[PDB]
Amino acid sequence: GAMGDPGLVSAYGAGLEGGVTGNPAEFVVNTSNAGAGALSVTIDGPSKVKMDCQECPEGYRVTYTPMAPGSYLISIKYGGPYHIGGSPFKAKVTGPRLV
């Protein structure tokens, strides 16, 4: 089938588990099982995050940096306003608070 689907889309990499404040946390939204389609993605937790989202052969890579300890929900939505398989993911973060 030519159309992608949010149940065929998944996500992988260390950024779904989290990291430390000021340190980069990296994961991929993987489209290899789905084909192609539009993506949105939002990260919400104890503060905001700085994101570098980029397209690639692996799908869409997201690197982000957190700035407060606690846990962030990584909400990932493909082909429409609906969560992909396993989303939202809870990423856990430690270290000093910047704000």
**Interrupted after residues, the chain (C–N over 2.5 Å):** none
Rounded Cα distance, 13 and 74, in Å:
12
Burial (CB count within 10 angstroms: exposed 0-12, middle 13-18, buried 19+), residue 80: exposed
Hey, what domains does the chain have and what are their CATH numbers? 1-99 (2.60.40.10)
Which tokens go with 98?
């910047």
Contact status, residue 8 vs residue 32, Cβ threshold 8 Å: no
DSSP class of 16? G
Which residues share a beta bridge with 75?
Answer: 42
Alpha-carbon span 13 to 15, nearest angstrom: 6
Buried-state track 40-62, b at ≥16 Cβ within 10 A, e below 16: ebebebebebeeeeeeeeebbbb
Return the SS3 of 91. Answer: strand
Closest by alpha carbon to 76, among 91, 92, 66, 95?
91
Give the long-range contacts of residues 51-56, CB within 8 A, separation 24 or more: 56/28
39: closest CA among 57, 59, 15? Answer: 59
| Residue pair 52/41 in contact by the 8 Å Cβ criterion | no
CA distances from 22 to 13, 37, 44, 57, 96 (A): 18, 32, 16, 28, 9
43 near 72, Cβ under 8 Å? Answer: yes
